[PDB]
Amino acid sequence: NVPQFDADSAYLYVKNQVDFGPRVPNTKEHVACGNYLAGKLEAFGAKVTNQYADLIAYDGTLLKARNIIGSYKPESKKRIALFAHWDTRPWADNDADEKNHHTPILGANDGASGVGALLEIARLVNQQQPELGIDIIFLDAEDYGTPQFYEGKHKEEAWCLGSQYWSRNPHVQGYNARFGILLDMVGGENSVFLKEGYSEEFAPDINKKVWKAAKKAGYGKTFIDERGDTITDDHLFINRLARIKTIDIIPNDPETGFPPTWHTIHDNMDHIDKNTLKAVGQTVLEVIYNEK
Numbered sequence: 705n706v707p708q709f710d711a712d713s714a715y716l717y718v719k720n721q722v723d724f725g726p727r728v729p730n731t732k733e734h735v736a737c738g739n740y741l742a743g744k745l746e747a748f749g750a751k752v753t754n755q756y757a758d759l760i761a762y763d764g765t766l767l768k769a770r771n772i773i774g775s776y777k778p779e780s781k782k783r784i785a786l787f788a789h790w791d792t793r794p795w796a797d798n799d800a801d802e803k804n805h806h807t808p809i810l811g812a813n814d815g816a817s818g819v820g821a822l823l824e825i826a827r828l829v830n831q832q833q834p835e836l837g838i839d840i841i842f843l844d845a846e847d848y849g850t851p852q853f854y855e856g857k858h859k860e861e862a863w864c865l866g867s868q869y870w871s872r873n874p875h876v877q878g879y880n881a882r883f884g885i886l887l888d889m890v891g892g893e894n895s896v897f898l899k900e901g902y903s904e905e906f907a908p909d910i911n912k913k914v915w916k917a918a919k920k921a922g923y924g925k926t927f928i929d930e931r932g933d934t935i936t937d938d939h940l941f942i943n944r945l946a947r948i949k950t951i952d953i954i955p956n957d958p959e960t961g962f963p964p965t966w967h968t969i970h971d972n973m974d975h976i977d978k979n980t981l982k983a984v985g986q987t988v989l990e991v992i993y994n995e996k
């Protein structure tokens with residue numbers, strides 16, 4: 705019996721994060737939201753480990769980062785890692801309107817959606833424990849990468865600073881997981897998810913498992929069994945540095961690639977659909993509960 709993901713509950717966790725305002729590293733709203741997330745994990749029975757680190761951004765800015773890890777059955781050596789980034793981008797640098805290019809986004813889909821879905825998973829995992837140990841890992845400073853308008857070097861390593869840190873410095877010595885699943889932008893209206901490129905390179909068997917689970921759960925029209933783009937995201941560094949086979953569940957829009965709200969001021973609750981959260985969340989539950 706796999707638990708039923710509650711879309712209303714997940715939607716509320718997304719909204720609560722967005723209600724702090726932008727979660728830009730080094731702002732009081734970021735601090736407050738981090739406290740909220742750590743608090744929710746504790747309330748859902750997780751052992752919480754905080755990883756505070758001074759991460760240096762593309763331009764030399766020190767970011768007071770905090771990765772947040774909630775662990776279930778922590779003494780188990782057979783584990784599944786679930787990841788989402790919780791920071792939000794400080795510049796709406798893909799906005800159609802050039803006047804918005806320096807305005808922080810709300811990151812309802814890009815940030816809050818992955819975290820919200822994993823909080824709902826954590827609530828259920830607490831209630832009805834799967835066989836494997838589950839880690840819920842909220843990664844900071846994913847989205848402080850080089851602005852589009854920057855003229856100069858655009859290095860891949862500017863992104864995903866928190867996952868790079870976690871991947872080099874696991875929260876517990878000897879950490880291992882059977883596989884990982886990263887959720888990024890999993891609440892957008894009308895979103896479809898295709899097999900992402902690095903996911904196919906490092907963990908094609910995990911992609912196969914997830915997409916098959918989605919079909920069996922009735923979400924085959926949301927998880928389309930075709931390949932999409934190759935995307936620099938937290939899973940790239942987790943695969944390369946931590947060597948945990950990790951896939952990215954991330955939308956592919958045929959027109960725009962990313963969702964049309966991506967890195968615009970329109971990434972807010974108006975474009976979140978709880979049915980998208982449900983498709984992704986139920987699929988993740990179906991996978992983790994069927995591991996033995």
Ligand SMILES: CC(=O)NCCc1c[nH]cn1
Pocket residue numbers: 814846847863888935936937
């Ligand atoms: C190809 C690319 O620029 N990816 C940026 C990482 C990211 C941010 N938000 C979602 N994905």
Ligand SMILES: [Zn+2]
Pocket residue numbers: 793814847967
């Ligand atoms: Zn982003």
